[PDB]
Each structure stands twice: as C-alpha cells, then as structure tokens.
Ligand SMILES: *[C@@H]1O[C@H](CO)[C@@H](O[C@@H]2O[C@H](CO)[C@@H](O[C@@H]3O[C@H](CO)[C@@H](O)[C@H](O)[C@@H]3O)[C@H](O)[C@H]2NC(C)=O)[C@H](O)[C@H]1NC(C)=O
Ligand SMILES: *[C@@H]1O[C@H](CO)[C@@H](O[C@@H]2O[C@H](CO)[C@@H](O)[C@H](O)[C@H]2NC(C)=O)[C@H](O)[C@H]1NC(C)=O
Ligand SMILES: *[C@@H]1O[C@H](CO)[C@@H](O)[C@H](O)[C@H]1NC(C)=O
Ligand SMILES: *[C@@H]1O[C@H](CO)[C@@H](O)[C@H](O)[C@H]1NC(C)=O
C-alpha cells in the first residue's frame with residue numbers, strides 16, 4: 128500500500144497549508160501591532176502567537192510519528208527533521224511551568240535594570256536610554272567604571288542563580304531531544320546531511336570556528352595594539368603598553384563593538400569621511416527615493432523589482448498619524464507573497480545603506496518563496512544577514528556613490544581616507560569577532576559542564592584576557608554573572624551566528640566581485656550592473672534551506688566551509704598600515720593585570 | 721436570432737469555488753466574442769484549438785461556460801496537459817481541449833480584510849479527476865490503513881481547504897476569476913455562431 132515516506136509527504140502537504148495560513152494570520156497581527164501600538168492590537172498579536180504555538184507543537188508531535196529513518200528523499204527528510212526536532216518544550220509541564228518563568232524573570236531584570244550614580248544616588252539610570260549613552264560618549268574612567276560595575280553587580284548577581292538553573296533545565300531539555308547539552312542543541316543549526324561531503328556534523332563547528340579564528344588572530348592583535356596605543360593617550364595612568372584593555376573603556380557596555388572608539392583612534396583626523404547625507408538633503412531626496420535607488424541596484428544585477436504590495440503596505444517613514452511605532456529596521460515575509468519593510472527611514476547615508484541591506488533580506492525572502500514552507504529560510508542562521516551586508520558593502524563604495532549621483536564625479540580616493548574607512552570597518556567587524564567567539568565558547572563549555580560553577584566567572588575573565596585582550600576593571604567573585612549582563616545571554620539566544628555571518632559575507636563578496644571581473648582592492652567593488660553576480664547569487668538564494676548549507680556556499684564561493692581569506696583580503700590595506708604603525712610597539716597582551 | 725448571455729456568466733455577482741465549479745450551457749444564440757478579446761480587464765486569454773478573432777465568423781454545436789475562483793499562480797494550472805492540485809483534484813481539461821481560458825484578477829470583490837475564506841479547493845483525492853469531472857465530496861481522505869471513523873485524525877485529513885484572500889496578499893496568492901469556454905465541434909446542428 129502506502130509507505131511511511133508517502134504518508135509523511137501527505138502529512139507535510141497538509142501541514143504546509145495550515146502552517147502558511149496560520150503564519151500569515153500571525154504575521155498580519157504582528158504587523159498591525161509593530162506599525163500601530165494599541166492595547167487591542169497587542170492583545171490580538173498575543174492571541175495569534177498562542178494559536179500559532181498550539182499548532183506548531185501539535186504538528187511537531189505528529190511529525191515525530193513518521194520515523195525519519197524510513198524517509199529517504201533528503202528534501203523531505205530535512206522538512207520532517209525541522210518539524211519534529213522541536214522539543215524545547217518536551218518535559219514536565221512543571222519544568223515548562225516555572226522554568227519558563229525564570230527565563231521571563233531574566234528578561235524582566237535586564238529590561239528594568241537601573242543603576243544609580245554613587246555621587247548622585249538619586250540619579251538612577253536605565254540601560255537602554257541612559258547608560259548606553261555614557262558608555263558610548265564618555266571618556267571618564269571613573270564614570271565608565273561606575274556604570275560597568277553597577278550593571279554587572281545589581282543585575283548580574285541577581286541573574287546568577289537563575290542562570291544556574293537555566294543551565295540544568297536547558298541541558299535536561301537537550302538530553303531529552305537526544306543532544307548532549309544545550310550547546311550541542313544550539314550547534315544543531317549547522318548540522319546538515321545529503322550527497323557526498325556536503326553533510327556537516329555539529330562537532331565540526333567548534334573546529335572550524337577555532338580554525339578560522341586562529342587565522343584572524345594576527346589581524347586582531349595588531350588592531351588591538353593600535354587601539355591600545357591610541358587609548359593610552361586618552362586614558363594614561365590606566366593602560367599598560369603591554370597588557371590588556373580595561374573592559375569599561377571600550378565602545379559600549381561590553382567590548383562587543385569597538386565602533387565608538389573611532390574619535391579616539393581615527394588614523395588621519397584631518398581628513399573627513401564620506402558623508403553623502405548632505406548631498407541627499409540638498410537633492411531633496413525622500414524615503415521613497417532611497418528605496419527606489421535600492422530597487423534599481425537589485426534590478427541592475429538581474430534580481431526582480433519590489434512587488435506592488437511592497438510599496439502599498441510597507442511602513443517606510445515614521446507615521447505622523449500619531450500611531451506609536453517600534454523604530455527598528457525590520458524586513459517582513461508574511462507568507463503569502465506579502466513582503467514588506469518597517470523602517471522609520473530618514474534622509475541620511477546610514478539609512479540609505481541599511482535600506483539596501485533590508486531589501487537584500489526581502490530579495491532573499493522573494494527568491495525562496497518557490498520552496499515549501501519549512502524550507503523557506505536562509506541556508507543557516509548566518510546567510511540572511513550575510514546577504515544583507517553584501518548589499519550594504521556595494522552600495523557604499525565611492526564608485527557606486529558617484530554613479531548614483533551623490534559624490535562629485537571627480538572624487539578622489541586618497542589612501543588616507545581609505546585607511547580611515549578600513550579602520551572604522553575593523554573597529555566593528557573585526558573587533559567583535561574575538562568577543563563573539565569567546566562568549567559562545569564560555570557558554571558551550573558551561574553547558575558541557577567543563578567550567579564548574581565555582582570557576583564560572585573565574586574562567587569568563589580568564590578567557591577574556593587570553594582571547595579578547597580585555598581585563599576586568601575590578602575583580603569579580605562567583606557572586607557575579609557578567610555574561611548574563613547581555614540581552615542575548617540573559618534572553619537565551621545563540622551568539623555564534625554573529626561570527627559565522629561575518630566570515631560568510633566576505634566569501635560571498637569576493638565571489639560576486641570576482642564575477643563582475645572587478646579589478647583592485649576588494650574593499651572597493653560595486654557588483655552593480657553585473658548580471659553574472661546576480662545569477663551566481665540568485666541561484667543560491669532560491670535554494671533556501673532545501674539543500675545543505677555547504678552546497679549553497681559552494682555554488683557561490685566555490686568552497687564547502689568557512690574561509691577567512693576573503694575577510695583578510697578585504698582588510699589587507701589596513702593590515703599593512705597597522706603592522707608598520709606597531710613596529711616599535713609590543714603586539715600581544717600579557718595575559719595578566 | 722438572439723444574443724448569447726455571456727454577460728450573466730462573466731459579470732456574475734457571485735462566483736463559484738473551483739471544486740464546485742459551475743457550468744452553464746450556451747443555447748441557440750449568437751455572441752460577439754470580440755467584446756471579450758477587446759477588453760483589457762483580462763489577465764489571461766489563451767485559446768486552444770481555435771483562432772481567437774476568427775471565432776466571430778465560426779459556428780459550434782454546443783458551448784459550455786465553466787466558471788470558478790482560483791489563485792493567481794494556479795491559473796497556469798487550467799490549461800491542457802497540466803499537473804497540480806487544481807488540475808488533478810478540482811478541474812481538469814482534456815488534452816484535446818478546443819476552447820478558450822479567460823481569467824482576471826479579482827482582489828476588488830473576492831478578498832476582504834481578515835480574508836474571504838468562502839472560496840475552497842480540494843487538497844487530496846484518491847485518483848485524478850477525469851476531463852470535466854466534478855467531485856463535491858466531503859469525506860475524510862484516508863491516506864493509510866487505519867480507517868478514518870468519519871473524523872479527522874492520523875493519516876486522515878478533511879479533503880477541502882479554504883483559500884484565504886486578504887487584499888495585502890501577493891498576486892500569485894490573490895483571487896482570480898476564471899471562465900473556461902468549451903467549444904463543441906460536432907457533426908450535429910450548429911446553434912452557436914458569430915457574424916455568420
Ligand atoms: C551602471 O549602469 C548605468 C547605466 O549606464 C550607469 O549610469 C550611467 O552612467 C553614465 C556615465 O556617467 C551616464 O552617462 C552620462 O550621460 C549624460 C546624458 O544622459 C552625459 O551628459 C554624460 O557626459 C555621460 O555621458 C548615464 O547617463 C548614466 N545613467 C543612465 C541611465 O544611462 C552606471 O554608471 C553604471 N555603473 C554603476 C556602478 O552603477
Ligand atoms: C518592474 O516589474 C514589472 C513587472 O513585474 C516590469 O514590467 C515588466 O517589464 C519587463 C521588462 O520590460 C517585461 O519583461 C514584462 O513583460 C513587463 N510586464 C510584466 C507584467 O511582467 C517593469 O519593467 C519592471 N521595472 C523595473 C524598473 O524593474
Ligand atoms: C490602531 O488600532 C486601533 C485599535 O483600537 C484602531 O482603532 C485604529 O484604527 C488603528 N489605527 C490605524 C488603523 O491607523
Ligand atoms: C524529492 O521530492 C520532490 C517532490 O516534489 C521531488 O521534486 C524530488 O525530485 C525528489 N527527489 C529529490 C532527490 O529531491
């Protein structure tokens with residue numbers, strides 16, 4: 128009669144239907160909220176999230192009744208695996224009863240956290256709008272230090288017990304879903320099977336991360352030296368020319384991005400940086416024109432143009448009707464050919480670039496819409512934001528800026544502003560790579576139970592010093608939970624995406640800028656007008672999750688795994704400048720204070 | 721003699737759901753096929769067997785007007801020799817079809833905010849439709865050995881699902897009305913003609 132695979136194909140044919148219908152209703156609900164804030168619409172969004180959850184859990188149980196080992200078309204196997212491999216909620220309802228409340232408890236702490244200036248204890252400030260500013264705009268060692276320690280104390284020490292329980296429960300859920308720890312579970316997202324050598328094993332992710340970081344270390348070391356040296360001139364009496372960097376003295380509340388150390392690290396301050404914002408202002412551009420120029424970019428490579436739903440239903444400019452709105456750039460796929468973008472766009476160069484990034488998302492969304500629902504997503508958690516960044520890299524090149532008509536045709540690329548730009552790039556892109564690798568390595572080890580709680584923070588900072596070159600301002604006992612002082616950690620999110628995403632793009636860029644027969648420094652290419660780039664790219668964007676992410680990558684870059692060489696290339700100009708500048712300095716950090 | 725009622729078909733107020741497609745006979749009458757191929761409302765106008773404009777000079781023994789509402793991306797399924805759930809489980813045309821397929825977008829009437837879930841389609845069926853077959857069953861589809869006790873369950877699905885037509889949807893997921901004109905070339909008396 129009818130095999131397990133045949134029955135399951137039908138099963139998926141039905142799920143897809145009920146899934147896309149109920150997702151489209153959730154999506155429309157969430158739109159009505161994010162774009163118009165009302166108690167009513169908030170309620171309705173929660174209601175639809177409830178119906179959606181119910182549906183997904185029931186279907187996941189039903190999916191587990193079709194034994195995967197009897198399903199044999201790898202495409203179907205991937206869909207079933209996704210549907211049945213959902214069991215974060217697969218243990219005592221009591222576990223889910225309160226051990227979801229601790230999760231909720233954590234977020235509420237992080238969201239309501241308030242630390243008071245010891246000099247003005249009356250002046251207690253929140254993180255989101257009152258401390259993040261200090262940590263980005265202040266040069267006062269003492270001010271920055273009271274903010275840093277106040278946060279890690281008031282909040283981290285509270286979150287410490289919660290995080291401990293969180294670990295034991297999440298490890299139980301993992302073990303339940305046949306995964307060694309919450310670590311193995313999260314590293315599932317990279318697991319793949321199919322064809323020959325196109326498969327990927329969760330136990331390789333560690334290798335490849337480590338391997339690639341090994342190759343980035345030189346670059347980072349030099350950036351570190353250079354930043355240190357400049358920082359010494361701002362914070363002398365605090366920085367050893369040979370040690371690590373104090374954690375509060377970096378760009379933000381964590382050393383996540385060294386982006387806001389530019390004023391303190393600018394290579395040639397006299398030379399200003401290309402800011403088309405004035406051009407756009409004078410040329411009386413508006414939001415629609417930004418997005419229309421974006422659309423042209425994608426059309427010129429051979430990608431489609433935005434749907435009409437896109438223009439009709441998108442929030443492209445903060446509303447004047449009074450509606451309260453979440454002003455954060457998002458790119459929506461509401462599952463029925465309804466694609467949209469929610470962005471309080473303003474006439475500025477940044478918004479211009481991010482419009483190209485977000486439409487990059489929409490373009491991915493549109494390209495895989497020919498795939499079954501469960502396969503409608505980027506090959507892994509890195510691909511989407513890699514694609515978005517590709518767009519923003521081409522859009523910003525001085526070449527592209529001229530062709531658009533925002534530069535002056537006779538613009539000159541002095542090797543000095545090139546260096547300024549490549550530094551700022553490094554300060555965000557390269558800087559976060561160490562931080563990101565360490566943070567996930569600490570979490571992975573904790574989940575594997577290789578860091579006994581008695582030595583949790585003792586390794587946290589130990590590792591910070593060895594890998595990130597950062598040292599703790601004051602010493603912290605095991606009453607602290609500094610890693611939980613990050614939205615991602617205390618709010619239960621994978622962080623390794625941010626690392627892999629980065630290695631992935633430069634591969635992509637070197638591959639598409641290689642098809643456009645671009646000659647010269649990779650940091651200066653615009654894939655514009657290149658249909659060969661367009662095709663190379665589209666022929667993977669369509670795949671979605673339907674083939675193993677290794678295959679998708681190979682189709683574009685020509686390789687099956689992370690290769691840091693394109694990244695290194697993208698920065699090779701900056702790298703040589705840095706090496707000279709640190710010739711008569713020490714590069715490296717003595718691990719200890 | 722008299723003019724054919726093509727109006728009542730195309731400009732009909734309420735349209736049918738593809739699984740319950742509606743059929744109307746064209747009695748002794750003459751119609752101007754030009755008013756059809758001279759209107760710009762029509763998204764898809766593909767004629768099989770016949771020459772579009774020469775119809776105004778031809779004669780046919782019978783004409784059948786089948787009408788149903790479908791999805792944009794499914795209009796490609798209503799053509800001779802096609803696979804799909806629409807062409808296999810709801811409305812199949814014969815490989816030797818000799819008629820025309822006319823279709824237009826209808827977001828304006830068939831879609832509503834929150835969605836007009838009134839139009840439906842057959843998702844599963846034990847065997848493909850035969851040319852011009854119709855199936856308005858509502859029996860639980862039994863995919864496996866376990867018998868469906870007239871209730872939906874494991875490997876036991878209700879066969880008909882609802883299009884959700886929200887105006888914000890994409891063209892391909894947007895409502896499109898479809899009229900299929902079947903022309904009968906028989907040795908019998910020809911009572912459907914044009915400009916003689
Ligand atoms: C991608 O392709 C477009 C289309 O060719 C490029 O934009 C075009 O660039 C040229 C070069 O500046 C423009 O030519 C100019 O034409 C005017 C008269 O129209 C003339 O006064 C100038 O002396 C010059 O010959 C052209 O107008 C312009 N746009 C169009 C629609 O043709 C673009 O530069 C290409 N590259 C990139 C990176 O976008
Ligand atoms: C934007 O898209 C529309 C349709 O999606 C384009 O109109 C099509 O234009 C192309 C190129 O001339 C033709 O191949 C099609 O036949 C046209 N119509 C349809 C219905 O597809 C329009 O040209 C596009 N414009 C830009 C600037 O991308
Ligand atoms: C926002 O939501 C409220 C709910 O009370 C609704 O009345 C209002 O019409 C909405 N605003 C729009 C649609 O602009
Ligand atoms: C798997 O199933 C789909 C069903 O539509 C089919 O297109 C494909 O050829 C099958 N085989 C492989 C190897 O994907």
Ligand SMILES: *[C@@H]1O[C@H](CO)[C@@H](O)[C@H](O)[C@H]1NC(C)=O
Pocket residue numbers: 259260261263264
């Ligand atoms: C830093 O200052 C700018 C204005 O100079 C302000 O807009 C921003 O909110 C401040 N804080 C940051 C960037 O964290």
Ligand SMILES: *[C@@H]1O[C@H](CO)[C@@H](O)[C@H](O)[C@H]1NC(C)=O
Pocket residue numbers: 725726727728729730731755756759
């Ligand atoms: C439907 O009405 C329009 C004008 O209202 C007309 O042009 C068209 O031919 C009509 N359809 C018929 C007669 O089948």
Ligand SMILES: [Zn+2]
Pocket residue numbers: 458484485488512515
């Ligand atoms: Zn994004």
